[PDB]
Amino acid sequence: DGTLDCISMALTCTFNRWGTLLAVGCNDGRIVIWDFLTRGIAKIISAHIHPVCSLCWSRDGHKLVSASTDNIVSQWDVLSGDCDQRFRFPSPILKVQYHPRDQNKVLVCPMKSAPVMLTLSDSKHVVLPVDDDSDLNVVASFDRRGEYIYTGNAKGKILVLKTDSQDLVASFRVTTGTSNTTAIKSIEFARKGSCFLINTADRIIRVYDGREILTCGRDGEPEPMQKLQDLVNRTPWKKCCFSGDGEYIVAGSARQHALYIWEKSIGNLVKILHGTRGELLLDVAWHPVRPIIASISSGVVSIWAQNQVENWSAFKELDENVEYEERESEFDI
Amino acid sequence: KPNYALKFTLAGHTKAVSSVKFSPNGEWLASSSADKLIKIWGAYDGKFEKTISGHKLGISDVAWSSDSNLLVSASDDKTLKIWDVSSGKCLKTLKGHSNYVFCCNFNPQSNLIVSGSFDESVRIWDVKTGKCLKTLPAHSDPVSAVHFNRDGSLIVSSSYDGLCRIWDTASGQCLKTLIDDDNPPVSFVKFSPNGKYILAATLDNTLKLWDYSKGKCLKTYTGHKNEKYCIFANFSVTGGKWIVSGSEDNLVYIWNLQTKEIVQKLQGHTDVVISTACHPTENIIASAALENDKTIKLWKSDC
Amino acid sequence: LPMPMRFRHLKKTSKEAVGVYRSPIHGRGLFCKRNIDAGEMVIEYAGIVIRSILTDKREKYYDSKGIGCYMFRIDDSEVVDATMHGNAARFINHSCEPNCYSRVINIDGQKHIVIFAMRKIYRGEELTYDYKFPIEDKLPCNCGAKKCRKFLN
Ligand SMILES: Nc1ncnc2c1ncn2[C@@H]1O[C@H](CSCC[C@H](N)C(=O)O)[C@@H](O)[C@H]1O
Ligand SMILES: Nc1ncnc2c1ncn2[C@@H]1O[C@H](CSCC[C@H](N)C(=O)O)[C@@H](O)[C@H]1O
Ligand SMILES: [Zn+2]
Numbered sequence: 140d141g142t143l144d145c146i147s148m149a150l151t152c153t154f155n156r157w158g159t160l161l162a163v164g165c166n167d168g169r170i171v172i173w174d175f176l177t178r179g180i181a182k183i184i185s186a187h188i189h190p191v192c193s194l195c196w197s198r199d200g201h202k203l204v205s206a207s208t209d210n211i212v213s214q215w216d217v218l219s220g221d222c223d224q225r226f227r228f229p230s231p232i233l234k235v236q237y238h239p240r241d242q243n244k245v246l247v248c249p250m251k252s253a254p255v256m257l258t259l260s261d262s263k264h265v266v267l268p269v270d271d272d273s274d275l276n277v278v279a280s281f282d283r284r285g286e287y288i289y290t291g292n293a294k295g296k297i298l299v300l301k302t303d304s305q306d307l308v309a310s311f312r313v314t315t316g317t318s319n320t321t322a323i324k325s326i327e328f329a330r331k332g333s334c335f336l337i338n339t340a341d342r343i344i345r346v347y348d349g350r351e352i353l354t355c356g357r358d359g360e361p362e363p364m365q366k367l368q369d370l371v372n373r374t375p376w377k378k379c380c381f382s383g384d385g386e387y388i389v390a391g392s393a394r395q396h397a398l399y400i401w402e403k404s405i406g407n408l409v410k411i412l413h414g415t416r417g418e419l420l421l422d423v424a425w426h427p428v429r430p431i432i433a434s435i436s437s438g439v440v441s442i443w444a445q446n447q448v449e450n451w452s453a454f455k456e457l458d459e460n461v462e463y464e465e466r467e468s469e470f471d472i
Numbered sequence: 473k474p475n476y477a478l479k480f481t482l483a484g485h486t487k488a489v490s491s492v493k494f495s496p497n498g499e500w501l502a503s504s505s506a507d508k509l510i511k512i513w514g515a516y517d518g519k520f521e522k523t524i525s526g527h528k529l530g531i532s533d534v535a536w537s538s539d540s541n542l543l544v545s546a547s548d549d550k551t552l553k554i555w556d557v558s559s560g561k562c563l564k565t566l567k568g569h570s571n572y573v574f575c576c577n578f579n580p581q582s583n584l585i586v587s588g589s590f591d592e593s594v595r596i597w598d599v600k601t602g603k604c605l606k607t608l609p610a611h612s613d614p615v616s617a618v619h620f621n622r623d624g625s626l627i628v629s630s631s632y633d634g635l636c637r638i639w640d641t642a643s644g645q646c647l648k649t650l651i652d653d654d655n656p657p658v659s660f661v662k663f664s665p666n667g668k669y670i671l672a673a674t675l676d677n678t679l680k681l682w683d684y685s686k687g688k689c690l691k692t693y694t695g696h697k698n699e700k701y702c703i704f705a706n707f708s709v710t711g712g713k714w715i716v717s718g719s720e721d722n723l724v725y726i727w728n729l730q731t732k733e734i735v736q737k738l739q740g741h742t743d744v745v746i747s748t749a750c751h752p753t754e755n756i757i758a759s760a761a762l763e764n765d766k767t768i769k770l771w772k773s774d775c
Numbered sequence: 776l777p778m779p780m781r782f783r784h785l786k787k788t789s790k791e792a793v794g795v796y797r798s799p800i801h802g803r804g805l806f807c808k809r810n811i812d813a814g815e816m817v818i819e820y821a822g823i824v825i826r827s828i829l830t831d832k833r834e835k836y837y838d839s840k841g842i843g844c845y846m847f848r849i850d851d852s853e854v855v856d857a858t859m860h861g862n863a864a865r866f867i868n869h870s871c872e873p874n875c876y877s878r879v880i881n882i883d884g885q886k887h888i889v890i891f892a893m894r895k896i897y898r899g900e901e902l903t904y905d906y907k908f909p910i911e912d913k914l915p916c917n918c919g920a921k922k923c924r925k926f927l928n
């Protein structure tokens with residue numbers, strides 16, 4: 140539905156705060172900041188020699204946190220492209236995430252170690268707690284306002300901490316239905332409201348409302364707002380995301396390189412988008428204020444927009460025949 | 473009511489002037505004409521800054537950049553040309569319009585260009601590569617004026633076929649089509665400063681301010697004379713809220729914005745006052761007349 | 776399949792089945808965007824359903840407004856007038872060799888004029904049917920068909 144030839148080795152992308160720019164990582168380890176309106180590249184940053192697998196914009200949009208595969212995280216000013224700060228860790232980093240309401244702070248999910256929240260002003264770090272002490276794979280994310288931290292382990296356990304004190308404000312373990320746990324693949328939140336989603340190893344996305352987890356307390360049984368899956372193919376989900384408003388949810392079937400689109404309230408599947416059967420789906424993102432969806436597959440990015448009835452359909456356009464309502468004086472002088 | 477008095481008279485274009493525009497900083501005045509020449513002048517003293525040539529045919533429109541650093545020139549050579557105002561260098565020459573290009577405008581973020589041509593199709597252009605990104609069979613007649621909204625989400629277009637069409641920028645979607653019960657040839661169109669209204673001139677001695685959210689004409693302005701040429705209209709805001717325009721009677725008409733009543737008539741031009749420009753900061757109005765005058769006059773009022 | 780079910784399917788798929796583009800026949804016209812099988816519903820000429828006696832009063836009205844008449848005779852009693860309110864079917868050119876044909880259907884008591892496909896129409900093809908305009912005294916035709924009557928009338 141529209142691709143870009145000007146970028147190669149697309150690996151990970153991230154919309155800015157207003158959905159005007161897109162920073163995509165490349166295998167060479169370069170940042171390609173490409174613009175939507177001019178439909179061209181806005182910037183090229185020599186980030187790492189190692190490909191970049193995690194990228195996040197700052198709220199003001201002037202900072203981008205990038206993670207190399209060399210366990211090298213670095214902050215870059217979008218105007219200049221300089222490495223503002225640079226750090227390295229053990230247990231290679233799985234993800235970075237700016238704090239949405241404090242760009243000085245940034246959480247980092249490493250591979251084998253617990254996620255740690257650092258600051259840029261001071262090169263300090265706060266290691267977030269781990270429930271089972273043996274997960275070795277815990278994804279973590281700020282909420283919409285950056286007030287709480289949601290951490291999900293490979294054993295389905297879900298901890299909600301407060302971002303400042305790291306104190307356990309809520310907890311619950313998700314189930315595979317019967318009695319078993321499932322590897323929490325990812326935690327996503329809505330940029331609007333409080334609904335969030337969890338991708339798990341059961342290939343079943345679970346949509347909740349964080350207020351219900353907060354009122355559920357520690358070690359409770361919160362039910363999901365929704366349960367979403369491909370009941371037909373039972374396909375895993377490499378990457379999923381909400382819509383900009385938060386009423387549409389998309390999942391990327393890397394198994395068959397497709398895109399499933401459900402709703403939030405009803406949860407019925409909006410639609411499906413099919414990509415090149417030969418392409419391996421890698422990354423998925425939604426335009427924050429547009430029905431536009433960016434996909435990264437086999438190093439190539441594709442764009443999926445959604446237009447209205449007009450752009451040619453605007454006499455007064457009607458859809459179905461209209462019986463004329465004759466009047467009393469319809470034949471009168 | 474304004475008391476605009478003539479302060480500086482500017483001239484030098486060997487042919488009919490087609491557009492004069494104040495720089496957004498109010499530092500310069502760019503004047504385009506059919507003589508394939510553009511003229512930058514001092515905006516406060518009438519000091520002729522320089523002449524920028526390079527276009528192959530007559531110039532029908534020119535538009536400033538928001539940072540007062542670039543100028544797009546739409547010429548009758550079917551080409552646009554983006555110039556650095558400081559060096560006068562032809563940074564870009566935009567090819568692709570199949571006929572005479574009549575109007576041109578930058579996006580509010582100055583990184584994009586809209587262009588109307590005689591080909592009756594509106595082209596949407598990159599700035600940093602100068603590449604045409606979109607092209608729309610907008611009207612059934614040569615386009616007269618195109619302009620951006622306050623942010624660059626909407627593009628308004630006018631043409632001789634009398635249609636005023638609002639189009640989506642991201643998609644080219646023809647959002648709205650404003651009709652006034654007839655087919656009056658619309659020679660100019662532009663958004664309101666608040667992006668809430670639209671000023672459109674029709675070639676029947678009539679100006680019309682429409683509500684965008686309502687899609688209906690809110691105010692009308694007459695008393696001037698405009699029936700053949702692309703006479704520009706501007707919002708006087710640095711002092712009182714007025715509507716300033718040229719007229720085919722050698723006058724510079726100034727109506728009250730709200731009451732729609734003529735608040736001043738600047739006389740001194742000998743030909744049709746073909747182009748108008750309002751200073752962004754000061755109560756200064758540049759009025760350029762046609763070839764029987766070939767003069768640009770600065771007017772300064774106290775309110 | 777039921778004419779109501781077929782009609783619902785047609786009204787669901789019409790917006791994405793056909794388009795309007797610049798036409799070598801004349802100006803702008805209806806082109807096929809997805810291969811259309813023979814006899815299947817191509818498009819409704821949707822519009823204002825009126826009685827026949829009110830046609831002239833409308834026509835003269837448009838004659839007073841300089842607006843072209845977009846009317847198709849449903850039958851001796853009804854007409855779909857699409858001049859002021861219609862759909863994309865107002866951009867179907869005519870060809871002496873049509874791959875389409877107009878038929879009136881009755882859904883729940885109301886008549887609908889649906890252009891169906893005379894043959895298997897493929898993507899990109901411009902959609903044309905037989906207007907069957909009576910012989911006047913002359914509109915030249917540029918349909919391009921070898922059997923072209925040189926005139927609709
Ligand atoms: N096959 C044909 N031969 C000659 N004229 C044709 C034609 N098909 C259509 N036309 C002309 O095209 C007109 C269609 S009304 C549509 C007007 C114009 N094509 C537009 O898109 O805006 C008719 O009035 C008729 O005069
Ligand atoms: N063979 C033909 N010769 C002349 N006009 C034709 C024609 N076939 C279709 N038309 C045009 O079709 C119109 C009636 S229905 C309009 C459909 C037309 N394709 C359009 O784009 O508007 C008439 O006004 C006439 O101009
Ligand atoms: Zn024919």
Ligand SMILES: [Zn+2]
Nearest residue numbers: 870871918923
């Ligand atoms: Zn024929």
